[PDB]
Amino acid sequence: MKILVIQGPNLNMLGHRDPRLYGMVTLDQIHEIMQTFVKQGNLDVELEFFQTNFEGEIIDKIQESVGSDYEGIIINPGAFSHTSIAIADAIMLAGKPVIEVHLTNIQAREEFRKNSYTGAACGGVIMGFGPLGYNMALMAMVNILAEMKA
Amino acid sequence: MKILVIQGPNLNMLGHRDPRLYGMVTLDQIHEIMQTFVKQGNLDVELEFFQTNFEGEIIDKIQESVGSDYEGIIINPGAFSHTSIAIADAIMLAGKPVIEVHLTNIQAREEFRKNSYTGAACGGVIMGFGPLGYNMALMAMVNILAEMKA
Amino acid sequence: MKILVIQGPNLNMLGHRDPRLYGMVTLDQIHEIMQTFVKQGNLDVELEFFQTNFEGEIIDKIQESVGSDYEGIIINPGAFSHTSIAIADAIMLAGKPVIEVHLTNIQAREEFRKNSYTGAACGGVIMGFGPLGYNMALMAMVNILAEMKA
Amino acid sequence: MKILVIQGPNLNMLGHRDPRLYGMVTLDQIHEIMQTFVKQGNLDVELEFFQTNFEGEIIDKIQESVGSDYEGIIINPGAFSHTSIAIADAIMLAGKPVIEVHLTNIQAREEFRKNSYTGAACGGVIMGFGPLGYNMALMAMVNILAEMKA
Amino acid sequence: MKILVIQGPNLNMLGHRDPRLYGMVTLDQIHEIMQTFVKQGNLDVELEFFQTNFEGEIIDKIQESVGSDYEGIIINPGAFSHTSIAIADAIMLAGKPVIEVHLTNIQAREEFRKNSYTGAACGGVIMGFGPLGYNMALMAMVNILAEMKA
Amino acid sequence: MKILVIQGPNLNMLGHRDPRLYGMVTLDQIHEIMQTFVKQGNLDVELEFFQTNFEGEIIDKIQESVGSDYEGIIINPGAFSHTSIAIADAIMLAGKPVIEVHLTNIQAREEFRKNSYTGAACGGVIMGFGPLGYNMALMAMVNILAEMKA
Amino acid sequence: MKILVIQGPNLNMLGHRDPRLYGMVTLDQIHEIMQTFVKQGNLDVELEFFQTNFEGEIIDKIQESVGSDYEGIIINPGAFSHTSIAIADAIMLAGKPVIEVHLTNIQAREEFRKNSYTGAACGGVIMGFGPLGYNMALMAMVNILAEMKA
Amino acid sequence: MKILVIQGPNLNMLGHRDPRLYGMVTLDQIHEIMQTFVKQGNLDVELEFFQTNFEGEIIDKIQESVGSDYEGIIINPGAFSHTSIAIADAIMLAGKPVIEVHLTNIQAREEFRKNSYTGAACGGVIMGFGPLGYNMALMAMVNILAEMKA
Amino acid sequence: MKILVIQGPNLNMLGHRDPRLYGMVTLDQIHEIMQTFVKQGNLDVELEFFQTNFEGEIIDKIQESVGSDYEGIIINPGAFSHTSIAIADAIMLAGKPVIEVHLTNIQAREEFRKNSYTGAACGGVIMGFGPLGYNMALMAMVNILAEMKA
Amino acid sequence: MKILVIQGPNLNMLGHRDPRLYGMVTLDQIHEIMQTFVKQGNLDVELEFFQTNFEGEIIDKIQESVGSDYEGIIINPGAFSHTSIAIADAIMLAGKPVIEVHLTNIQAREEFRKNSYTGAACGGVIMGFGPLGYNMALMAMVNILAEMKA
Amino acid sequence: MKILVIQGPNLNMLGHRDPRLYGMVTLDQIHEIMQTFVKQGNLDVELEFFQTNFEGEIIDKIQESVGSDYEGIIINPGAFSHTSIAIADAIMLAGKPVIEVHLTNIQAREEFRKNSYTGAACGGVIMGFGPLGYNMALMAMVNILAEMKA
Amino acid sequence: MKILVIQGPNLNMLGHRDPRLYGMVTLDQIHEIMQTFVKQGNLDVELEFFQTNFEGEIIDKIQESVGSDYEGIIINPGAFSHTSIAIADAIMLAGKPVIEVHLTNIQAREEFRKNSYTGAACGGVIMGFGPLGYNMALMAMVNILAEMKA
């Protein structure tokens, strides 16, 4: 399985800004942890990582995934979760499993973070576990894709 | 007349995804149908087609149209219809006729599709006719631009 | 094809009142223009025109259309667009194509004009083209009814 | 007892349109069933049936009932339930028992059907039993009018 | 001056129903009082009175007034005040002074009576004076029409 | 047929408190009246009555009904109608006919009583007939269960 | 009869500012016109005029009116109409007739002017007649106070 | 570690009702799967399982957990997620990690399921993975409790 | 006088959890303080204390109070204040004085705590005084019950 | 301790107007009762009483209290409770205990009385006990100020 | 140029209360800083400073400014920004430039501070710069008044 | 100090489109005016100017500023002010002073312009001064950065 990991606006600043709220582990470190989760698990998974601050680049990437290459997406759309009907539509149209991850619990913050157009379009959502959420999503994606093969 | 046809996020997937809702005619096929409508009508129209998943590329394109080249725009902003005040402002500022087209009837879907900032900025709106909407928009634009010349 | 053209409350005052907003072309003139569109197109269309200020007369007329006589409706429900669930239900129940036309762009006026119960019930909606909208609707209806025959 | 049965907009299409939602029993058939309920019950009831798509005709009829002739009303105002403050006022002013019936459960459909101005004005409301609701209303009206005589 | 007095749904029941709220003076009595106000004032006014429970009949009547006959309207639209965008549009389009009267203070009742589409379209509104409101409206109309002549 | 009659919070106080609004007939008296309706009708119905002030006891009881014993439920959830998504879900999951009864017209009281999650989940709803509503519900349930057998 | 005329915030600028919207007749001129209406009518009325930009001074004045001196109030609370629950309470507590006047039609302006706490507390409201509204209010007050004496 | 697994209203019907939406795996089967996840992982975890349809029993259980016995809770509050401020407070007061699981994606259903008072009180939330969500929660809890020990 | 003191969900954790917000005085300590207030005052009061996390147990207890034993209730419904229409109805139906106490100022916290269905049903409400509120309520209840005896 | 008792708009009319709702005890009588509560209690309290219908006079008075003279405020802001952010800010800025009292239960009246900006700024709120509320507030203030000294 | 500086409710407490949020610079100090800005700039400006906690005194002052004396106003209406339609109207009617200043960023605080009726009436608004905002406003006013002279 | 000036969507059209609302001074002219303000002031400021119609390019630029090069940002996000939570987050995360400027008063336009996510994230906001706002922002930034150095 190729699994695409899409990281949205501002995620590249992880570990460098607002450590109180988002922690001290960087985005690159999360990606190395995900690799280690696959390698140590001997999972038949190839991870591709992609970060961007552009809505259009997320949509382009999701559309790129219409192919025999990629079998699922794990996405943290950042602030676009709450605003991007376009990304939500791209997810709906992807026709492959998509899992949404948030570092924080978006039910427990400002009112404007409670809506997730993208999350509503995803099969499942994981929030509030920090970096561990991405490993949870990896566990879940492997299990989903194996279920679909069976 | 040069008429610019702008197609927004996800429109490039037409005919390939969710055929139940959006049909089996591709974006390229719609564009060939529009050309055929002009050629068979002997209309003095040059069509330029542009698709993008980027809000900023739509705005750049609309601004590009401030010129003796282009006389009107037919636009399907996709999901940005409901979210993009920036595109709505660009339309307001274009100072040339703009017609909004939607494949679907955005009054008859989710509540979040009912608002169209962009449509409110356009002279007219056409929705719910599938690909035929673009030919309706072409008919209308030709008639508007001929009225303005008179 | 028999196509029924239903014009709602206040439409009979067109061309005589508020010309700034609704123009100087009368309702009778629009109807003659629609005929000319059919005759010059050699379209196999018989138009029937009906105007009324009564919700109940619109519903009676729509129900009248349950028959081998009429194959589609083009309707401008006027202000009843925003208020009449009853007309919306009649449209839903008609089981024939219905197209809604507005002279003005009802996305670009008072907040109370944005809701269209009737438009949500229609296959398609055309707004903001003035009288030309009715010819667009005629073009569209002919194409829809020909598609259904095929 | 004279009991007036008022059937609102679109009810005359019952059994002929949207059978999935509203069933295959016609309005005339419901009225014959109500008669049979009275005759087989030996109830001292004279039914008068009235259907109309006009709000004003419902109000005129309700006002007609200010008389020694009619002792109660069973009404299905159709879509006017949700919109007609005027009919609600007529009901309030009738000074005789009025029972509202809906074929469908208007709590379980679109948000715009949940409000019933007319139902709020009625003594009681019955919804979601299809045609049987009218017999329930008949049972209830007989019992109410007998209680009032005692 | 011909002044048209339009009385909306349920007004014909005045004095006969809910006397606690609407009083014991009938509609016919109000009309005789208005005549007496004109006659005793030696006002150069011809009153025409019209009551109806039909929205469409109000609109037809208002349109009838597009003429050298009638110079102003005093209207109590009843419950249609709160619902009828169509009547509000007819008033806007009338191009003659229109005054709205309510017997009751519609600011001091149910929340659903607070909106008056028709009142917003009228030059002025009078509410809460019972039958006296109509004489106030007559005083006002005479003064307005005399100001316009000067 | 076994028919389960579930009476929710505060119903056990009927006839003892607030007689102006809820009447002077006790809950036990309503239950005896329902029995008499069955016995005098020679209906093949076994009634089981259950009252509780506990949401969880209502849900437990509804789940108890997943069995060859009980064929339908008549429920007055009291105030839980407006609040209990859990009871609404239990009703949805019951897979047997459920009818909601209210003594009062919950469209005609405080705004907070207008929502009925439970009523939306029920096949039908009866409100505003006082104790008679339960007999109406019994009539209806017998007719529904006989229709299902046929 | 002593009639107190209370003029609220900004009314003292009438005729001097925004003549397009509020006209060119000053507050002092309106007061002289009201006197002339009484004198020419030989009405047994003593007018007292009071203008202030202070909510507390309006309330003090209204309370001052608890006395054999003053029999009614005509009030234009200006912008306090929309905000002042305190003035609304003072009006409720006055136990004498109070009539609210607005120069403009507060149904036809900004959304924030539509609410009138004070108007809801008044017996009647007059709006949209400019200065003439005050004479209408005077006519009405005389008639109300004469009715109360009878 | 003792981990308490709390299952709320209606969860005991899993696998027996509405399999389309909630699947065919029973609650007991999920619990055996969780045990197998611990046993096969050689995790130092003792699971305690508790299901109830009572809000008060959930709160009692959570309070029971104030002790050296239990170190974390995995909870699916069912419909109480959307309604129970009391359970949310109990979670806040527990002073131990709590993870919320939903079988379904509560962002993608009825509007009334979008609010989760309980989820906002939890450290993290997992939704839309069916039974697998509970294993994800187990993975997460073990990792959280191990982090806290370090 | 027997005075029933009802303490709702989570109150039994007082003094043990979240001392910053709710203080360090336990529920048992508050109850001993209330006794001391009665004993030192030589008040003719018998206190009965009852805490529960169950809505149904509160309602059962309130209904228990329909008797010559208990003359008033002091209640802190906890989180049920904001949610429980059922408890509010039980209070309305109790026909004895009920006083609501909150430790905290529920006007000064989350928006979801501002509504108190139960408080609206109570004669009076005391909030924000911590444990002292219960003594204030005791002072008040004694004075109310003595006034009723006179 | 000097305790300032501030009474807001309309409170000076207590006992003279609307006795049904606000009772027959005057403001002066409440103040004498408060004195008697202090004198009979031998409390070391000096009361200062201040009533005004002016928002600005309340704010001036509260600011006056920034001094060694006054140690706490008991305030009934009347209708300004619901409207005055300015008074709420003055309370926040006072840096001394402030208790809000309402005669009536402002949770149980019009929707517009439910918001209390001032109450949210106060340490505690007492409502619905009539004049007794002020003695409750006095009891509470003495206890608060004694706690602060310790 | 005479420039009037109006400071609203509570501003006189600046530097003495809540220094964390509003700083330690007093109102008098801000006024001396503004003078120094004019003197050091050799600006042809005469400053007049006015602080008050009374809405009516602000309106009186603004009206005072209708004169050859004063050419512009810099205003911080304090909490009246969010509530005072009357002050907003006075500003609209002033017919001279008015600039609104807030010490804090009123977009970044409580929801109830986001609305500024007064700010909407002003030419420009400055917020969130503390005392420096007043010097920014002075810079701006000088530039505006010089532009108007040219 | 390096100060970054970020200009958002559509700002590049300034002076060329809608001069009535946005004036005739171009963006390049504003930038030259800002330079002149620095040069004539002998301010130790290096301005960098950046305009874009892309949300992602604004975020990239803001992140670019995490460096010893740039010390503050002046931003006009255009229409993204009202929509872009992503840009608001980037501003929050920048950890350097950011000032928002709008040419127009966004409190005085369409309702949809009133929300500014970005402005809420900024230290301060300036609106309604046209091009002068940018010089005000420059004055302010210099003063802020000098205060931080001290």
Ligand SMILES: O=C(O)[C@@]1(O)C[C@@H](O)[C@H](O)c2sc(CCC3CC3)cc21
């Ligand atoms: O919790 C999450 O994962 C969010 O998706 C919630 C979003 O509401 C928010 O915009 C953001 S911003 C962000 C990266 C912040 C990093 C430290 C620089 C993550 C998220």
Ligand SMILES: O=C(O)[C@@]1(O)C[C@@H](O)[C@H](O)c2sc(CCC3CC3)cc21
């Ligand atoms: O009906 C339309 O034309 C819409 O503009 C309505 C928008 O709400 C929606 O986001 C989308 S997505 C889309 C392309 C979908 C294509 C099959 C891959 C079109 C539209």
Ligand SMILES: O=C(O)[C@@]1(O)C[C@@H](O)[C@H](O)c2sc(CCC3CC3)cc21
């Ligand atoms: O733009 C349209 O076609 C509308 O359907 C929009 C509706 O909101 C409105 O009530 C009206 S009124 C009207 C006839 C006005 C004619 C000059 C006398 C048309 C319409």
Ligand SMILES: O=C(O)[C@@]1(O)C[C@@H](O)[C@H](O)c2sc(CCC3CC3)cc21
């Ligand atoms: O369920 C009901 O009885 C309703 O009153 C609910 C209303 O919301 C609705 O407009 C309609 S339309 C209708 C007649 C439909 C018939 C098959 C042609 C009934 C009703």
Ligand SMILES: O=C(O)[C@@]1(O)C[C@@H](O)[C@H](O)c2sc(CCC3CC3)cc21
């Ligand atoms: O106060 C008024 O004049 C109203 O226009 C207010 C409307 O809200 C209401 O529907 C009605 S109904 C009515 C006639 C009632 C008559 C005794 C049978 C008048 C009015």
Ligand SMILES: O=C(O)[C@@]1(O)C[C@@H](O)[C@H](O)c2sc(CCC3CC3)cc21
């Ligand atoms: O009208 C009904 O049947 C209601 O279900 C409506 C609900 O809103 C309400 O909580 C209550 S309370 C109740 C029992 C009251 C009994 C005299 C002690 C019934 C109901």
Ligand SMILES: O=C(O)[C@@]1(O)C[C@@H](O)[C@H](O)c2sc(CCC3CC3)cc21
């Ligand atoms: O139309 C009315 O009478 C109003 O009461 C409506 C209010 O909304 C408004 O604040 C104002 S301001 C005002 C005096 C304006 C005068 C020319 C300086 C009157 C009114």
Ligand SMILES: O=C(O)[C@@]1(O)C[C@@H](O)[C@H](O)c2sc(CCC3CC3)cc21
């Ligand atoms: O998806 C979930 O896990 C939910 O927590 C979502 C809730 O909104 C809902 O009430 C319910 S009902 C339920 C058990 C249903 C079982 C088949 C009988 C689970 C849930």
Ligand SMILES: O=C(O)[C@@]1(O)C[C@@H](O)[C@H](O)c2sc(CCC3CC3)cc21
């Ligand atoms: O302030 C109050 O008294 C409240 O009634 C306000 C409610 O909103 C809240 O749910 C709770 S929770 C609670 C007990 C908390 C105890 C330390 C474990 C009290 C209350």
Ligand SMILES: O=C(O)[C@@]1(O)C[C@@H](O)[C@H](O)c2sc(CCC3CC3)cc21
């Ligand atoms: O109940 C209370 O104490 C209130 O603060 C509630 C407020 O909403 C109301 O404006 C008023 S008016 C008032 C004095 C009324 C007196 C008999 C002349 C008190 C109050």
Ligand SMILES: O=C(O)[C@@]1(O)C[C@@H](O)[C@H](O)c2sc(CCC3CC3)cc21
């Ligand atoms: O930030 C501002 O300038 C405000 O105008 C915002 C308003 O919302 C607020 O009421 C207040 S209160 C105030 C003076 C507070 C001083 C330390 C005693 C200023 C303001």
Ligand SMILES: O=C(O)[C@@]1(O)C[C@@H](O)[C@H](O)c2sc(CCC3CC3)cc21
């Ligand atoms: O007033 C401002 O500075 C705004 O930021 C307000 C925004 O709501 C709006 O989208 C726009 S569009 C714009 C550039 C318009 C230029 C003439 C082509 C500026 C702004």
